[PDB]
């Protein structure tokens with residue numbers, strides 16, 4: 001068209017246009033005060049409305065990147081506040097924009113956002129609902145500049161939905177709080193995953209990302225043809241590269257495009273794309289991405305036919321190695337939506353390896369005729385880990401289960417920080433509840449989803465504070481061996497126990513009046529320390545001590561003289577316990 005702005009306005013809407021212009025500027029000028037952004041937005045919106053009225057109105061013809069960068073260079077305190085970034089304004093568009101992207105602080109040093117009192121929130125929400133959400137939108141945006149704007153805008157409405165609902169309830173806190181906790185963890189998970197996807201694209205490169213996307217896409221669209229899957233996997237990889245780089249506009253258009261393509265060729269991809277394709281521009285992509293699996297043909301032949309039997313496999317393989325392998329994935333993938341993408345990759349890799357050590361022998365056909373027999377132990381390992389661990393998560397609740405892990409992982413890598421062992425073990429226990437609720441069919445893909453961000457969150461810590469060579473061995477290893485490495489860790493025998501510190505086992509009467517969250521964390525922290533002190537303690541010995549303790553807490557936070565009970569009854573526990581544990 002003649003006006004890009006007028007165009008975005010028209011199909012975006014005044015409401016969404018404004019929210020996004022805000023988020024956009026907030027991600028670039030993360031130091032400027034809110035009231036300052038609110039002025040630009042109006043300035044820009046007054047403009048956009050000018051073009052919608054006359055596509056020929058001065059400047060309406062300029063590209064968005066040009067108009068955007070032009071306004072940024074209007075901030076007078078740019079040089080003073082941002083300095084080095086003000087240098088970009090000297091460059092001409094192609095470079096200029098490239099420059100700003102460079103000087104975009106990923107994790108700026110701003111104060112952690114505190115959650116005010118439900119009542120103060122609801123009241124703020126009442127008197128001024130818009131500026132209430134605009135201010136927090138601005139707070140999140142500047143703190144997370146690489147977060148996909150339209151997705152940030154998606155959470156925004158889910159937040160406004162909870163305040164609308166809960167601030168009208170009699171029991172506000174009881175309503176609001178559990179949603180703000182859910183939303184929080186959800187947005188945090190969505191962020192880590194995106195920061196995790198761009199990490200992989202960088203480390204392992206295109207091939208590995210494509211193989212991943214192939215197995216993934218073909219799991220969702222098992223009816224689509226390998227030609228379509230290829231098409232998409234290719235377009236998809238071009239989108240992530242663009243979005244990762246951080247350009248909002250190019251990443252937005254690219255996703256819009258791929259979204260329309262998938263909607264138009266809908267009958268050629270999935271039957272479950274109905275709803276998503278009827279939604280508005282700003283939502284199509286998000287919808288499809290979160291879309292559900294399609295039922296698989298069931299009119300499906302078999303794999304052993306085209307990949308283990310049919311001679312000419314080496315012929316078709318050597319002709320185009322990766323496409324053949326990609327064909328193996330697409331085929332094995334779409335037949336197993338109950339497999340984690342990494343498990344599938346683990347099999348394609350095995351296959352690839354065999355084809356290489358077989359197509360180079362006298363009678364190949366008899367060399368690789370036992371391949372599938374090798375997929376067995378690779379499948380059962382994670383399968384068995386799921387049952388085993390979900391079976392235990394039932395015997396004991398989420399909390400009791402988290403403690404089993406604590407005792408378990410503390411024994412693996414004792415060297416690790418206690419506040420970290422506790423956090424990691426808590427998050428793990430959570431993955432156990434969020435997924436073991438599911439039936440066998442959806443268990444593995446679930447666990448992989450969560451485990452992937454937890455294991456990476458855990459590696460980033462060791463990144464800035466190494467402690468164990470082992471943890472570092474798996475953290476650096478391939479994303480396909482990243483998980484099986486951790487499960488292989490064995491109890492540390494090299495470890496020399498810690499020296500007793502009564503302070504570490506001295507509990508005053510504060511735990512009685514603490515939130516469940518605090519009682520547990522306090523108890524769990526001591527548990528980790530108990531293991532670090534006596535690492536050779538049986539599951540039995542340990543249970544006994546944990547018994548005389550549970551009761552202990554009771555007999556003292558239910559007695560007429562707390563503090564005395566904790567000092568007198570305490571000296572008895574540590575003394576008796578010290579003796580039991582030898």
Ligand SMILES: CCCCCCCCCCCCCC(=O)O
Pocket residue numbers: 204207208210211214233322323325326345348349352478480
């Ligand atoms: C365009 C489709 C290409 C498919 C590539 C198939 C390769 C399968 C092996 C699994 C890749 C793991 C990555 C790696 O370790 O390098």
Ligand SMILES: CCCCCCCCCCCCCC(=O)O
Pocket residue numbers: 005008020021024064150248249252253255256259281282283284285286
């Ligand atoms: C003139 C203001 C421009 C600011 C940048 C906003 C453009 C983003 C468009 C978002 C379209 C949704 C694409 C998608 O479906 O993912």
Ligand SMILES: CCCCCCCCCCCCCC(=O)O
Pocket residue numbers: 505523524526527530545546547549550573574577578581
């Ligand atoms: C060697 C003296 C150590 C005695 C201190 C024991 C601390 C272990 C805390 C166990 C907490 C288990 C949690 C619970 O009881 O619910």
